[PDB]
Amino acid sequence: DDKMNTAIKVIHTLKAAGFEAYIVGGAVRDLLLGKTPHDVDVASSALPQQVKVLFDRTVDTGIDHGTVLVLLDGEGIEVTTFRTESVEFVLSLEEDLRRRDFTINAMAMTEDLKIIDPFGGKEDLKNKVIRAVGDPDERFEEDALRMLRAIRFSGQLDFIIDMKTLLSIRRHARLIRFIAVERLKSEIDKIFVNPSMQKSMAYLKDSVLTRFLPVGGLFEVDWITYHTDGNPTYGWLYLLHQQKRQFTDIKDYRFSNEEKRLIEKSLELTALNTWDQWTFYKYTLKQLEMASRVTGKKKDLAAIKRQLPIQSRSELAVDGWDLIEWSGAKSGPWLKVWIEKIERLIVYGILKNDKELIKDWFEDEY
């Protein structure tokens, strides 16, 4: 890995220019746990334009919130000025930390590996406890998504949620209605792929969040049989399938068109009593695999699809214009119907994908 080393470089450059700078947030948590951080954030007394003077290559997306992304040695380090939440730049590191979400995320490390832990992150980290920084009620009123993010952290770290924190989530769970469903779906998609998911869903019910989340009750299914395949979409498919419900019931979460096709097509497959060659031809392997997974089948799906005489309409040896020729009839919607009859006869290995043979077949049936 190189992200930690690079951030140390960034810290060092910032400090030579007279500024304070520290590793902050989740990387500190991850190191202290013995895990390689996926991201490293640097917190600094520097202001965004001051950061930009010190580094050749920078991305300026989040300057309004105070974040400059520094590109160096092939890595990307986010450099944020001290701040809270409507953003307000502040002057000290402890003004920043005292408004973050949870104690294990409210720590900072110096260039010389000293850790600053005003709010007991280190003891909470050793006890495996997600606890709000300071007053949980205030933390949740500042951003209600934190309530949900606490659940995502329990499964991501195999931690329990602190008792007072969890009772604050229960009292304030209703504020979840103000959060953009894009952010709600992002956290949920993380939970669906993370470990300790069956405990994460128990928290989602215990926290009363399922009472107020968009169609929150649908989450309360039996998650014993769920085993993530690394794709969050399989989480959404599982809960619908368990309840014999359709995609329309979850449309609130604003899926992509491609994601909605995977769910809808998969449900079609699970509703289908017998799969034959036409099934393997029309549906993507990714759809065939997901539907096997929810119904429990261990089939060798890829090989059955590979063995089919053709793979897609592309390969068909005739098109609507051949049929116009042979039929002597004008172009119309009928073409599609007949092309499909021909397509089935070829996928089933009855008719040979050969223009002259298809014409013979066509002459006799029309």
UniProtKB/TrEMBL annotation:
Residues 158-213 form the tRNA nucleotidyltransferase/poly(A) polymerase RNA and SrmB- binding domain. One of its GO terms (biological process) is tRNA processing. It comes from the Bacteria. The keyword Aminoacyl-tRNA synthetase does not apply. Gene3D superfamilies: 1.10.246.80, Beta Polymerase, domain 2, cca-adding enzyme, domain 2. Residues 21-131 form the Poly A polymerase head domain. The keyword Cell membrane does not apply. Belongs to the tRNA nucleotidyltransferase/poly(A) polymerase family. This is CCA-adding protein. It comes from Planococcus halocryophilus.
